[PDB]
Amino acid sequence: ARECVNCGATATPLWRRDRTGHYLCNACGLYHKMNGQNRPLTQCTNCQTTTTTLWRRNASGDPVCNACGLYFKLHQVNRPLTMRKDGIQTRNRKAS
DNA sequence: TTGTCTTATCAGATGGACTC
DNA sequence: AAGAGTCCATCTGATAAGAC
Ligand SMILES: [Zn+2]
Ligand SMILES: [Zn+2]
Ligand SMILES: [Zn+2]
């Protein structure tokens, strides 16, 4: 039940936090950082997944999922198909 | 019960569409 | 007409949760 504490949006291409760790949508997060006040009111080339919280690009400029993109950056080799975990994983990130 | 490694989820950078 | 500024999606980079 995540919600932008400024505008009330429940959907956004990227969730962000303010200095205190209060959640803000991408729009309200960028605005506050820039202005210092409140904002006024596809599939992976490697593993063929259609679901990720963040699309990245490979060296040729084609889309890869977050997992595949990060794996390649680290290892300089493509993510093997056997690494692909079923389901969606989430993590409780702490403040600051 | 600790250590490693994958990769979610945060933060920063870039630039197209739009207004001024 | 031609430049600077606003806005915010979407990209790259940083941090670190928790799978295993
Ligand atoms: Zn918002
Ligand atoms: Zn706040
Ligand atoms: Zn992938």
DSSP secondary structure, A45-78, as one string = TTT-----SS-EE-TTS-EE-HHHHHHHHHHSSP
Residue A52 structural domain = 42-86
Residues A28 and A1 in one domain: yes
Residues A53 and A82 in one domain: yes
Does residue A29 lie within 7 Å of nucleic acid chain B, judged by its CB? yes
In sequence order, the 6+-apart residues with CB closer than 8 A to the CB of A83 are: A47, A67, A71
Residues A29 and A54 in one domain: no
Tokens of A52: 């990720």
C1' (C4) to CA (A33) span, angstroms: 21
C1' (B11) to CA (A17) span, angstroms: 9
Distance CA A7, CA A13 (A): 15
Residues A3 and A29 in one domain: yes
- The total of other beta-carbon atoms located within 10 Å of residue A23's CB is 17
Bases of chain C below 7 A from a protein C-beta are 7-20
Distance CA A55, CA A40 (A): 29
Residues A34 and A17 in one domain: yes
The data reach a resolution, in angstroms, of 2.0
- The total of other beta-carbon atoms located within 10 Å of residue A38's CB is 14
Q: What's the longest Cα–Cα distance across chain A?
A: 47
Q: How many domains does chain A have?
A: 2
Amino acid letter, residue A96: S
- CATH code, domain with A74: 3.30.50.10
Tokens of A91: 């993590």
Residues A27 and A54 in one domain: no
Residues A6 and A30 in one domain: yes
Q: Can you list the pairs that A41-50 forms with residues at least 24 positions away whose Cβ atoms lie under 8 Å?
A: A41/A6, A41/A7, A44/A68, A46/A72, A46/A78, A46/A79, A47/A79, A47/A81, A47/A83, A47/A84, A49/A84
Q: Which residue is nearest to nucleotide C18 (CA to C1')?
A: A91
Exposed/middle/buried for residue A95 (C-beta within 10 Å: 0-12, 13-18, 19+): exposed
Distance CA A56, CA A44 (A): 9
